[PDB]
């Protein structure tokens, strides 16, 4: 009923999810010359030392690594946020070729991929309640460019052969998501939405300025995953990105000059 193909892709999503044409949809193009430096924005606090990864799963739209969010173990605070947001999962969006794959763009530039670390506001008790609130989630977005390998991604890439098709999962304990972060935490921020159905308008977006570099071999492994289930016609999981949506009545703020 929804995907990234011609007949069920982003241009169709509004029929089942009318909020797709809403006032705070994501992703957006980040126009760097219109984003305003906000000296009131605090440094982002990423506290991932006690993260407990659980599983890696092909859900037919991406692959995701899930975390134990039943306690304040891996949390995001600070930056534009009030209160504490627990890490639930990370996943990626990527392209069929290196010149596309990201969801956010920077002055219309598309990156080869984009990493989303999804966190929810503990004031609302569980993620299902958080997605119904305008400040319920915080998603840390990180761009990927192709160049050198990212050592902290290799443990992910090497297990993808075991979750090739929709529905497959595997144990993925003791994975440290700090290994996926760039050096700088300079960021842009704006209020937006989930980028997949149900497209709920519950996200404070925090998009890092500095991309991470991954190797061509690493992204090639992303592109060997399948959207389909085992035994169905093979359709490579590539181009699983929603394009930029209208900014409408929103301001993007920068944490840096
Ligand atoms: O593709 C995307 N770009 S995204 O960052 O906007 C983004 C955000 C999301 N979210 C959806 C939800 C609602 C609960 O669902 C979650 O239920 C948990 C168990 O409680 C997890 O087991 C499970 O992983 C799942 O995520 N929260 N975030 C999904 C896709 C995307
Ligand atoms: O003194 C200040 N420092 S400030 O930068 O914090 C600041 C911000 C503001 N505003 C922020 C907004 C919400 C976004 O709407 C904005 O985006 C445009 C394109 O999106 C149009 O919708 C509209 O023209 C608009 O510019 N409205 N006003 C006013 C004064 C000051
Ligand atoms: Zn469906
Ligand atoms: Zn995402």
Curated annotation (Swiss-Prot):
Its cofactor is Zn(2+); Co(2+). Its EC number is 4.2.1.1, 4.2.1.69. InterPro entries: CA_dom, CA_dom_sf, Carbonic_anhydrase_a-class, Carbonic_anhydrase_a-class_CS. Optimum pH is 6-8. Changing residue 194 to E/H/R: Strongly reduced CO(2) hydrase activity. The keyword Electron transport does not apply. Changing residue 196 to S: Enhanced p-nitrophenyl acetate esterase activity, but normal CO(2) hydrase activity. Changing residue 59 to A: Reduced activity. Changing residue 91 to C/D/E/N/Q: Strongly reduced CO(2) hydrase and p-nitrophenyl acetate esterase activities, impaired stability of zinc binding. The record marks 4, 59, 64 as: Fine-tunes the proton-transfer properties of H-64. It comes from the Eukaryota. Keywords: Acetylation, Cell membrane, Cytoplasm, Disease variant, Lyase, Membrane, Metal-binding, Osteopetrosis, Phosphoprotein, Zinc. Residues 1-256 form the Alpha-carbonic anhydrase domain. Gene3D superfamilies: Alpha carbonic anhydrase (3.10.200.10). The modification Phosphoserine is found at residues 162, 169. SUPFAM superfamilies: Carbonic anhydrase. Changing residue 59 to D: Strongly reduced activity. Activated by X-ray, histamine, L-adrenaline, L- and D-phenylalanine, L- and D-histidine, L-His-OMe and beta-Ala-His (carnosine). The active site is at 61 (proton donor/acceptor). GO terms for biological process: angiotensin-activated signaling pathway; carbon dioxide transport; morphogenesis of an epithelium; neuron cellular homeostasis; positive regulation of cellular pH reduction; positive regulation of dipeptide transmembrane transport; positive regulation of synaptic transmission, GABAergic; regulation of chloride transport. It is linked to Osteopetrosis, autosomal recessive 3: A rare genetic disease characterized by abnormally dense bone, due to defective resorption of immature bone. Osteopetrosis occurs in two forms: a severe autosomal recessive form occurring in utero, infancy, or childhood, and a benign autosomal dominant form occurring in adolescence or adulthood. Recessive osteopetrosis commonly manifests in early infancy with macrocephaly, feeding difficulties, evolving blindness and deafness, bone marrow failure, severe anemia, and hepatosplenomegaly. Catalyzes the reversible hydration of carbon dioxide. Can also hydrate cyanamide to urea. Stimulates the chloride-bicarbonate exchange activity of SLC26A6. Essential for bone resorption and osteoclast differentiation. Involved in the regulation of fluid secretion into the anterior chamber of the eye. Contributes to intracellular pH regulation in the duodenal upper villous epithelium during proton-coupled peptide absorption. Interacts with SLC4A4. Interaction with SLC4A7 regulates SLC4A7 transporter activity. Interacts with SLC26A6 isoform 4 (via C-terminus cytoplasmic domain). Belongs to the alpha-carbonic anhydrase family. This is Carbonic anhydrase 2. The gene is CA2.
């Amino acid at each position: 009923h929804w995907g990234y193909g011609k007949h069920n892709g982003p241009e169709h999503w509004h029929k089942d999810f009318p909020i797709a044409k809403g006032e705070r949809q994501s992703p957006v193009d980040i126009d760097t010359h219109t984003a305003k430096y906000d000296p009131s924005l605090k440094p982002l606090s990423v506290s991932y030392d006690q993260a407990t990864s659980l599983r890696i799963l092909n859900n037919g739209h991406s692959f995701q690594v899930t975390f134990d969010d039943s306690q304040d173990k891996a949390v995001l605070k600070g930056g534009p946020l009030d209160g504490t947001y627990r890490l639930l999962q990370f996943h990626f969006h990527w392209g069929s070729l290196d010149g596309q794959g990201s969801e956010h763009t920077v002055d219309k530039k598309k990156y080869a991929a984009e990493l989303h670390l999804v966190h929810w506001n503990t004031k609302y008790g569980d993620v299902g309640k958080a997605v119904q609130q305008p400040d319920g989630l915080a998603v840390l977005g990180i761009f990927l460019k192709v160049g050198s390998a990212k050592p902290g991604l290799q443990k992910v890439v090497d297990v993808l052969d075991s979750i090739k098709t929709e529905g497959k999962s595997a144990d993925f304990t003791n994975f440290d998501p700090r290994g996926l972060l760039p050096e700088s935490l300079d960021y842009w921020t704006y209020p937006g939405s989930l980028t997949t159905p149900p497209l709920a308008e519950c996200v404070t977006w925090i998009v890092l300025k500095e991309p991470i570099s991954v190797s061509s071999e690493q992204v090639l492994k992303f592109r060997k995953l399948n959207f389909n289930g085992e035994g169905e016609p093979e359709e490579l999981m590539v181009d699983n990105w929603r394009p930029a949506q209208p900014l409408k009545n929103r301001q993007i703020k920068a944490s840096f000059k």
